[PDB]
Structure 1
Amino acid sequence: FPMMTEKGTFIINGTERVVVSQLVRSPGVYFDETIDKSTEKTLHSVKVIPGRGAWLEFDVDKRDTVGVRIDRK
């Protein structure tokens, strides 16, 4: 198992390397609001985004009827 030196590095096949840290978006439920284009109407949305699985999204449209999409279908 490639181990890690006291300096914060790894040594791979002789060369010294560094595993940088990645910025990402956290899993969770993320709401929104996007002024509509056709009608200039507010309309909200949510989105549930885990590390693994399918994307489940709900919305409120201009017809004022809530809706859902599963696996972005």
Structure 2
Amino acid sequence: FPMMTEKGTFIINGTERVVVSQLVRSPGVYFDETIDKSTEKTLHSVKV
């Protein structure tokens, strides 16, 4: 298993590499409202 050094980096095949954090949408439940393209009405939706 590759191990992290005291500097917060990895060594792979002699090269020094860094794994950057990733911003991702959390596994929540999200409600939203949008404007219909055709009728211009307000459409409410939710996705889990």
Q: Give TM-score scaled by structure 2 length.
A: 0.85
CA deviations on 1:8-66 (whole Å, 9 max, x unpaired) are 1001111111011111111111111012222221110000xxxxxxxxxxxxxxxxxxx
Q: Which runs of 4+ in 1 moved over 6 A?
A: none
Following the alignment from structure 1 to structure 2, what is the Cα–Cα distance between the partners of residues 38 and 2? 55
Identity %: 100
**Structure showing greater relative contact order (alpha-carbon pairs closer than 8 Å, 6 or more residues apart):** 2
1:32 and 1:21 map into 2 onto residues whose CA distance is 27
Secondary structure of 2:35's counterpart equals coil
Q: Which ranges of structure 2 fall in alignment gaps of 5 or more residues?
A: none
Aligned length: 47
- Note the residue ranges of structure 1 that are not aligned, 5 or more in a row: 48-73
Corresponding position of 1:30: 30
TM-score, normalised to structure 1, is 0.59
